């Protein structure tokens, strides 16, 4: 049993999320089919199900907005999330959920979990358009490091002194501010006595705007 | 239709190799049957189903982990905890519409350390810019739980402040946060005094960095 995903995933907020699951192996009815959508750095949350009749259960935090369909001709399952915001902006996995079970006087789904998943396609919403960052130093045991603010998309690679520092570096996760764009930290602690003779540059790399800041006391 | 929701407890489980961890999921309402189930979610990977049907293992699970409980009350048990099973487990409940818990991070166990806090006012060149960024730095500290509170000229601050964290470190086994203020050109310019005021349980009393504007 494999699990395709696909879609796209930099949109605009006012705008439809479309994503599509496609699946390989096994019987595509008989099972219950589930999106589920995590936030970078949060919890999972379940968005929603569908079987092969059609017959839809969503999440009623986003009843009013999502919509789960399904294509039996080509084993495939769709979502659409409309009015998009900054709070959609996730992880999104399809899931194979329970089986159905038939019996002359009962039929329903049973052991609704969720296994495999799909790899997971990443949905960013934002408005704003590709951008190079703005490389700016954080001036000073001593800690010194370098501000890189206002870019998009991610990533952002950074280094120090071409590679020789990278004991005591810390480079934190990327924080999308409300403009739409990203910002940035990275920081490295020094003896205090290398601030005078030792030369410390950042190597700031954005390569989707193909884009050294010396930081100096 | 009916809404059931799971709390997982406790939040953050610090543990060394070796010991036993206990996580539990209380149901505001009862989970029927045995419909339950565990995930474990490794950073940057997918969940994994690692157990289903309250107590029933999934294929390629090791016999470190098993399920108990009913009703109300869940409990998932790790005999023997590896540098693997270092990571998040949610509980999901499908007795009625599925829903997941908040999550609970097993993470490896140190001695407390208390954190070097730095602060940088904004360059030149960015206030040049037209935007100022204050950074207050709190560098290797141990737990995770701080608290960074911003004070321009005693005035206290909230929403105009973001956070970030650093992953536990493969070697000393600490954090890293860093708290980024954004103001304007102009309402940095209007105030002076800018202090940032750090709280930590390996903190006596609450450490506070400031700077002057122009300083």
């Known amino acids: 049993v494999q699990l395709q995903q696909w879609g796209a995933g930099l949109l605009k907020p006012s705008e439809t999320l479309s994503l599509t699951c496609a699946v390989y192996?096994?019987?595509?009815?008989?099972?219950?089919w589930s999106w589920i959508r995590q936030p970078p750095g949060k919890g999972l949350e379940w968005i929603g199900e569908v079987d092969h009749s059609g017959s839809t259960n969503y999440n009623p935090s986003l009843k009013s907005r999502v919509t789960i369909s399904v294509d039996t001709s080509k084993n495939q399952f769709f979502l659409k999330l409309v009015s998009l915001t900054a709070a959609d902006t996730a992880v999104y996995y399809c899931?194979?959920?329970?089986?159905?079970?038939?019996?002359?006087?009962?039929?329903?789904?049973?052991?609704?979990?969720?296994?495999?998943w799909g790899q997971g396609t990443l949905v960013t919403v934002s408005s704003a358009s590709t951008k190079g960052p703005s490389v700016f130093p954080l001036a000073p045991t001593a800690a010194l490091g370098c501000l890189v603010k206002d870019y998009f998309p991610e990533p952002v690679t950074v280094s120090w002194n071409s590679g020789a520092l990278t004991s005591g570096v810390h480079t934190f996760p990327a924080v999308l501010q409300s403009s739409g764009l990203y910002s940035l930290s990275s920081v490295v602690t020094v003896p205090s006595s290398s601030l005078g003779t030792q030369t410390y540059i950042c190597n700031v790399n954005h390569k989707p705007s193909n884009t050294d800041k010396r930081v100096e006391p | 239709v009916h809404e059931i929701v799971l709390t997982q407890s406790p939040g953050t489980l610090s543990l060394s190799p070796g010991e036993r961890a206990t996580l539990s999921c209380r149901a505001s309402?009862?989970?029927?049957?045995?419909?339950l189930a565990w995930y474990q979610q490794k950073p940057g990977q997918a969940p994994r189903l690692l157990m289903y049907?309250?107590?029933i293992k999934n294929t390629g699970v090791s016999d470190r982990f098993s399920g108990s409980g009913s009703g109300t009350d869940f409990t998932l048990t790790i005999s023997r905890l590896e540098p693997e099973d270092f990571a998040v487990y949610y509980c999901?409940?499908?007795?009625?519409?599925?829903?997941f818990g908040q999550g609970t991070k097993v993470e490896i166990k140190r001695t407390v350390a208390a954190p070097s806090v730095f602060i940088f006012p904004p360059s030149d060149e960015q206030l040049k810019s037209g935007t100022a960024s204050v950074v207050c730095l709190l560098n290797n500290f141990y737990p995770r739980e701080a608290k960074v509170q911003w004070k321009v000229d005693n005035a206290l601050q909230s929403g105009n402040s973001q956070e970030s964290v650093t992953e536990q470190d493969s070697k000393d086994s600490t954090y890293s946060l860093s708290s980024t203020l954004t103001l304007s050109k102009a309402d940095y310019e209007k105030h002076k005094v800018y202090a940032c005021e750090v709280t930590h349980q390996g903190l006596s009393s609450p450490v506070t960095k400031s700077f002057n504007r122009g300083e």
């Open positions: 192996g096994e019987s595509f009815s008989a099972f219950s």
């Open positions: 309402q009862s989970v029927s049957a045995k419909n």
């Open positions: 999901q409940q499908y007795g009625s519409s599925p829903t």
């Open positions: 899931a194979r959920g329970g089986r159905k079970v038939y019996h002359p006087y009962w039929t329903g789904y049973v052991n609704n979990c969720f296994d495999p």
């Open positions: 049907g309250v107590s």
